[PDB]
Amino acid sequence: QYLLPEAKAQDSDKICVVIDLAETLVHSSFKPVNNADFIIPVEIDGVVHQVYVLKRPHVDEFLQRMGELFECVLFTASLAKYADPVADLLDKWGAFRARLFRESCVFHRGNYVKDLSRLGRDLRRVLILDNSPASYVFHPDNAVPVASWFDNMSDTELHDLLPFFEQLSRVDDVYSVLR
Ligand SMILES: [Mg+2]
Structure with a gap:
Protein backbone atom coordinates (compact mmCIF):
# COMPACT_ATOMS: atom_id res chain seq x y z
CA GLN A 1 0.00 0.00 0.00
CA TYR A 2 1.55 3.32 -1.18
CA LEU A 3 1.33 6.48 1.01
CA LEU A 4 -0.78 8.35 -1.55
CA PRO A 5 -4.00 7.27 -3.35
CA GLU A 6 -4.06 7.49 -7.16
CA ALA A 7 -3.54 11.04 -8.42
CA LYS A 8 -6.75 12.90 -9.22
CA ALA A 9 -7.26 13.86 -12.89
CA GLN A 10 -6.39 17.50 -12.22
CA ASP A 11 -3.07 16.38 -10.65
CA SER A 12 -1.80 13.28 -12.49
CA ASP A 13 0.20 15.12 -15.15
CA LYS A 14 1.82 17.46 -12.64
CA ILE A 15 5.05 16.98 -10.73
CA CYS A 16 4.45 15.89 -7.14
CA VAL A 17 6.09 18.10 -4.49
CA VAL A 18 6.50 16.96 -0.91
CA ILE A 19 6.57 20.03 1.34
CA ASP A 20 7.86 20.17 4.90
CA LEU A 21 6.22 22.41 7.51
CA ALA A 22 8.42 23.23 10.53
CA GLU A 23 11.37 25.53 9.76
CA THR A 24 10.49 25.26 6.04
CA LEU A 25 7.18 27.23 5.82
CA VAL A 26 6.50 28.11 9.49
CA HIS A 27 8.20 28.03 12.91
CA SER A 28 6.26 26.89 15.99
CA SER A 29 7.25 27.36 19.63
CA PHE A 30 5.96 26.65 23.14
CA LYS A 31 7.63 29.90 24.21
CA PRO A 32 5.27 32.92 24.00
CA VAL A 33 5.68 35.01 20.85
CA ASN A 34 4.31 38.52 20.57
CA ASN A 35 2.38 39.17 17.34
CA ALA A 36 2.28 35.49 16.34
CA ASP A 37 0.50 34.58 13.13
CA PHE A 38 -1.36 31.65 14.80
CA ILE A 39 -1.71 30.29 18.33
CA ILE A 40 -2.83 26.69 18.46
CA PRO A 41 -4.00 24.96 21.65
CA VAL A 42 -2.28 21.55 21.76
CA GLU A 43 -3.10 18.85 24.35
CA ILE A 44 -0.16 16.90 25.81
CA ASP A 45 -0.98 14.25 28.47
CA GLY A 46 -4.39 15.87 29.08
CA VAL A 47 -2.98 19.40 29.59
CA VAL A 48 -3.49 22.20 27.02
CA HIS A 49 -0.39 24.18 25.93
CA GLN A 50 -0.40 27.15 23.59
CA VAL A 51 1.80 26.71 20.51
CA TYR A 52 2.97 29.98 18.94
CA VAL A 53 3.32 29.90 15.12
CA LEU A 54 5.22 32.37 12.86
CA LYS A 55 4.82 32.26 9.04
CA ARG A 56 7.92 32.50 6.83
CA PRO A 57 7.90 35.67 4.69
CA HIS A 58 6.25 35.18 1.25
CA VAL A 59 4.60 31.85 2.24
CA ASP A 60 1.06 32.71 1.12
CA GLU A 61 2.26 33.71 -2.37
CA PHE A 62 4.56 30.68 -2.42
CA LEU A 63 1.88 28.18 -1.35
CA GLN A 64 -0.78 29.64 -3.72
CA ARG A 65 1.52 29.34 -6.77
CA MET A 66 2.91 25.89 -5.86
CA GLY A 67 -0.65 24.55 -5.48
CA GLU A 68 -1.19 25.47 -9.15
CA LEU A 69 2.17 24.29 -10.44
CA PHE A 70 2.30 20.93 -8.66
CA GLU A 71 0.49 18.16 -6.88
CA CYS A 72 1.45 19.46 -3.39
CA VAL A 73 1.76 17.04 -0.45
CA LEU A 74 2.36 18.11 3.16
CA PHE A 75 4.91 15.67 4.59
CA THR A 76 5.94 16.43 8.13
CA ALA A 77 7.96 14.57 10.82
CA SER A 78 5.67 15.99 13.48
CA LEU A 79 2.45 14.56 14.85
CA ALA A 80 -0.88 15.46 13.16
CA LYS A 81 -2.02 17.40 16.23
CA TYR A 82 0.67 19.98 15.58
CA ALA A 83 0.61 19.87 11.74
CA ASP A 84 -3.17 19.58 10.95
CA PRO A 85 -4.38 22.77 12.68
CA VAL A 86 -1.45 24.76 11.27
CA ALA A 87 -2.13 23.54 7.69
CA ASP A 88 -5.87 24.36 8.08
CA LEU A 89 -5.00 27.96 8.91
CA LEU A 90 -2.19 28.23 6.36
CA ASP A 91 -3.54 26.52 3.23
CA LYS A 92 -6.15 29.05 2.09
CA TRP A 93 -6.17 27.59 -1.47
CA GLY A 94 -6.48 23.83 -1.00
CA ALA A 95 -2.83 23.63 -2.16
CA PHE A 96 -2.06 20.53 -0.05
CA ARG A 97 -3.74 17.61 -1.83
CA ALA A 98 -2.65 15.23 0.94
CA ARG A 99 -1.12 15.32 4.42
CA LEU A 100 1.50 12.87 5.72
CA PHE A 101 2.86 13.00 9.26
CA ARG A 102 5.30 11.32 11.73
CA GLU A 103 3.90 7.76 11.16
CA SER A 104 4.67 7.99 7.41
CA PRO A 140 19.16 13.54 -2.57
CA ASP A 141 18.69 14.21 -6.32
CA ASN A 142 14.93 14.93 -5.81
CA ALA A 143 15.60 17.78 -3.41
CA VAL A 144 15.45 21.52 -3.44
CA PRO A 145 17.44 22.71 -0.40
CA VAL A 146 15.98 25.50 1.69
CA ALA A 147 17.54 27.15 4.77
CA SER A 148 15.94 26.56 8.18
CA TRP A 149 13.81 29.52 9.20
CA PHE A 150 12.93 30.68 12.75
CA ASP A 151 11.91 34.34 12.90
CA ASN A 152 14.03 36.30 10.41
CA MET A 153 11.53 38.61 8.73
CA SER A 154 14.11 39.65 6.13
CA ASP A 155 14.08 36.12 4.71
CA THR A 156 13.35 36.05 0.96
CA GLU A 157 14.09 32.39 0.34
CA LEU A 158 10.56 31.20 -0.52
CA HIS A 159 10.19 34.10 -2.95
CA ASP A 160 13.64 33.55 -4.56
CA LEU A 161 12.91 29.81 -5.05
CA LEU A 162 9.67 30.37 -7.04
CA PRO A 163 11.33 31.03 -10.47
CA PHE A 164 13.19 27.75 -9.97
CA PHE A 165 10.02 25.81 -9.17
CA GLU A 166 8.37 27.61 -12.09
CA GLN A 167 11.01 26.01 -14.29
CA LEU A 168 10.78 22.58 -12.65
CA SER A 169 6.99 22.39 -13.07
CA ARG A 170 7.45 22.29 -16.89
CA VAL A 171 10.13 19.57 -17.22
CA ASP A 172 9.55 15.89 -17.99
CA ASP A 173 12.30 14.58 -15.71
CA VAL A 174 13.41 16.48 -12.59
CA TYR A 175 16.75 14.62 -12.72
CA SER A 176 17.67 16.41 -15.97
CA VAL A 177 17.76 19.56 -13.81
CA LEU A 178 18.96 18.25 -10.41
CA ARG A 179 21.31 15.43 -11.72
MG1 LIG B 1 11.66 21.10 8.92
Whole structure:
Protein backbone atom coordinates (compact mmCIF):
# COMPACT_ATOMS: atom_id res chain seq x y z
CA GLN A 1 0.00 0.00 0.00
CA TYR A 2 1.55 3.32 -1.18
CA LEU A 3 1.33 6.48 1.01
CA LEU A 4 -0.78 8.35 -1.55
CA PRO A 5 -4.00 7.27 -3.35
CA GLU A 6 -4.06 7.49 -7.16
CA ALA A 7 -3.54 11.04 -8.42
CA LYS A 8 -6.75 12.90 -9.22
CA ALA A 9 -7.26 13.86 -12.89
CA GLN A 10 -6.39 17.50 -12.22
CA ASP A 11 -3.07 16.38 -10.65
CA SER A 12 -1.80 13.28 -12.49
CA ASP A 13 0.20 15.12 -15.15
CA LYS A 14 1.82 17.46 -12.64
CA ILE A 15 5.05 16.98 -10.73
CA CYS A 16 4.45 15.89 -7.14
CA VAL A 17 6.09 18.10 -4.49
CA VAL A 18 6.50 16.96 -0.91
CA ILE A 19 6.57 20.03 1.34
CA ASP A 20 7.86 20.17 4.90
CA LEU A 21 6.22 22.41 7.51
CA ALA A 22 8.42 23.23 10.53
CA GLU A 23 11.37 25.53 9.76
CA THR A 24 10.49 25.26 6.04
CA LEU A 25 7.18 27.23 5.82
CA VAL A 26 6.50 28.11 9.49
CA HIS A 27 8.20 28.03 12.91
CA SER A 28 6.26 26.89 15.99
CA SER A 29 7.25 27.36 19.63
CA PHE A 30 5.96 26.65 23.14
CA LYS A 31 7.63 29.90 24.21
CA PRO A 32 5.27 32.92 24.00
CA VAL A 33 5.68 35.01 20.85
CA ASN A 34 4.31 38.52 20.57
CA ASN A 35 2.38 39.17 17.34
CA ALA A 36 2.28 35.49 16.34
CA ASP A 37 0.50 34.58 13.13
CA PHE A 38 -1.36 31.65 14.80
CA ILE A 39 -1.71 30.29 18.33
CA ILE A 40 -2.83 26.69 18.46
CA PRO A 41 -4.00 24.96 21.65
CA VAL A 42 -2.28 21.55 21.76
CA GLU A 43 -3.10 18.85 24.35
CA ILE A 44 -0.16 16.90 25.81
CA ASP A 45 -0.98 14.25 28.47
CA GLY A 46 -4.39 15.87 29.08
CA VAL A 47 -2.98 19.40 29.59
CA VAL A 48 -3.49 22.20 27.02
CA HIS A 49 -0.39 24.18 25.93
CA GLN A 50 -0.40 27.15 23.59
CA VAL A 51 1.80 26.71 20.51
CA TYR A 52 2.97 29.98 18.94
CA VAL A 53 3.32 29.90 15.12
CA LEU A 54 5.22 32.37 12.86
CA LYS A 55 4.82 32.26 9.04
CA ARG A 56 7.92 32.50 6.83
CA PRO A 57 7.90 35.67 4.69
CA HIS A 58 6.25 35.18 1.25
CA VAL A 59 4.60 31.85 2.24
CA ASP A 60 1.06 32.71 1.12
CA GLU A 61 2.26 33.71 -2.37
CA PHE A 62 4.56 30.68 -2.42
CA LEU A 63 1.88 28.18 -1.35
CA GLN A 64 -0.78 29.64 -3.72
CA ARG A 65 1.52 29.34 -6.77
CA MET A 66 2.91 25.89 -5.86
CA GLY A 67 -0.65 24.55 -5.48
CA GLU A 68 -1.19 25.47 -9.15
CA LEU A 69 2.17 24.29 -10.44
CA PHE A 70 2.30 20.93 -8.66
CA GLU A 71 0.49 18.16 -6.88
CA CYS A 72 1.45 19.46 -3.39
CA VAL A 73 1.76 17.04 -0.45
CA LEU A 74 2.36 18.11 3.16
CA PHE A 75 4.91 15.67 4.59
CA THR A 76 5.94 16.43 8.13
CA ALA A 77 7.96 14.57 10.82
CA SER A 78 5.67 15.99 13.48
CA LEU A 79 2.45 14.56 14.85
CA ALA A 80 -0.88 15.46 13.16
CA LYS A 81 -2.02 17.40 16.23
CA TYR A 82 0.67 19.98 15.58
CA ALA A 83 0.61 19.87 11.74
CA ASP A 84 -3.17 19.58 10.95
CA PRO A 85 -4.38 22.77 12.68
CA VAL A 86 -1.45 24.76 11.27
CA ALA A 87 -2.13 23.54 7.69
CA ASP A 88 -5.87 24.36 8.08
CA LEU A 89 -5.00 27.96 8.91
CA LEU A 90 -2.19 28.23 6.36
CA ASP A 91 -3.54 26.52 3.23
CA LYS A 92 -6.15 29.05 2.09
CA TRP A 93 -6.17 27.59 -1.47
CA GLY A 94 -6.48 23.83 -1.00
CA ALA A 95 -2.83 23.63 -2.16
CA PHE A 96 -2.06 20.53 -0.05
CA ARG A 97 -3.74 17.61 -1.83
CA ALA A 98 -2.65 15.23 0.94
CA ARG A 99 -1.12 15.32 4.42
CA LEU A 100 1.50 12.87 5.72
CA PHE A 101 2.86 13.00 9.26
CA ARG A 102 5.30 11.32 11.73
CA GLU A 103 3.90 7.76 11.16
CA SER A 104 4.67 7.99 7.41
CA CYS A 105 8.35 8.78 7.98
CA VAL A 106 11.01 6.06 8.35
CA PHE A 107 13.17 6.48 11.49
CA HIS A 108 16.62 5.72 10.19
CA ARG A 109 19.81 6.31 12.19
CA GLY A 110 18.03 8.71 14.52
CA ASN A 111 16.51 10.87 11.75
CA TYR A 112 12.95 11.06 10.34
CA VAL A 113 13.45 10.25 6.65
CA LYS A 114 10.80 11.01 4.07
CA ASP A 115 11.05 8.02 1.79
CA LEU A 116 9.90 9.17 -1.64
CA SER A 117 9.68 5.58 -2.94
CA ARG A 118 6.67 4.99 -0.69
CA LEU A 119 4.65 7.82 -2.33
CA GLY A 120 3.41 5.94 -5.40
CA ARG A 121 4.57 8.52 -7.90
CA ASP A 122 7.21 8.22 -10.66
CA LEU A 123 10.40 9.58 -9.04
CA ARG A 124 11.34 11.50 -12.22
CA ARG A 125 8.34 13.63 -11.40
CA VAL A 126 8.80 14.06 -7.60
CA LEU A 127 10.49 16.88 -5.70
CA ILE A 128 11.03 17.48 -1.97
CA LEU A 129 11.22 20.83 -0.24
CA ASP A 130 12.64 20.42 3.29
CA ASN A 131 15.01 22.39 5.50
CA SER A 132 16.62 19.17 6.87
CA PRO A 133 18.92 17.37 4.44
CA ALA A 134 18.37 14.35 6.73
CA SER A 135 14.76 13.90 5.53
CA TYR A 136 15.86 13.32 1.93
CA VAL A 137 18.98 11.14 2.52
CA PHE A 138 17.49 8.34 0.35
CA HIS A 139 16.64 10.71 -2.54
CA PRO A 140 19.16 13.54 -2.57
CA ASP A 141 18.69 14.21 -6.32
CA ASN A 142 14.93 14.93 -5.81
CA ALA A 143 15.60 17.78 -3.41
CA VAL A 144 15.45 21.52 -3.44
CA PRO A 145 17.44 22.71 -0.40
CA VAL A 146 15.98 25.50 1.69
CA ALA A 147 17.54 27.15 4.77
CA SER A 148 15.94 26.56 8.18
CA TRP A 149 13.81 29.52 9.20
CA PHE A 150 12.93 30.68 12.75
CA ASP A 151 11.91 34.34 12.90
CA ASN A 152 14.03 36.30 10.41
CA MET A 153 11.53 38.61 8.73
CA SER A 154 14.11 39.65 6.13
CA ASP A 155 14.08 36.12 4.71
CA THR A 156 13.35 36.05 0.96
CA GLU A 157 14.09 32.39 0.34
CA LEU A 158 10.56 31.20 -0.52
CA HIS A 159 10.19 34.10 -2.95
CA ASP A 160 13.64 33.55 -4.56
CA LEU A 161 12.91 29.81 -5.05
CA LEU A 162 9.67 30.37 -7.04
CA PRO A 163 11.33 31.03 -10.47
CA PHE A 164 13.19 27.75 -9.97
CA PHE A 165 10.02 25.81 -9.17
CA GLU A 166 8.37 27.61 -12.09
CA GLN A 167 11.01 26.01 -14.29
CA LEU A 168 10.78 22.58 -12.65
CA SER A 169 6.99 22.39 -13.07
CA ARG A 170 7.45 22.29 -16.89
CA VAL A 171 10.13 19.57 -17.22
CA ASP A 172 9.55 15.89 -17.99
CA ASP A 173 12.30 14.58 -15.71
CA VAL A 174 13.41 16.48 -12.59
CA TYR A 175 16.75 14.62 -12.72
CA SER A 176 17.67 16.41 -15.97
CA VAL A 177 17.76 19.56 -13.81
CA LEU A 178 18.96 18.25 -10.41
CA ARG A 179 21.31 15.43 -11.72
MG1 LIG B 1 11.66 21.10 8.92
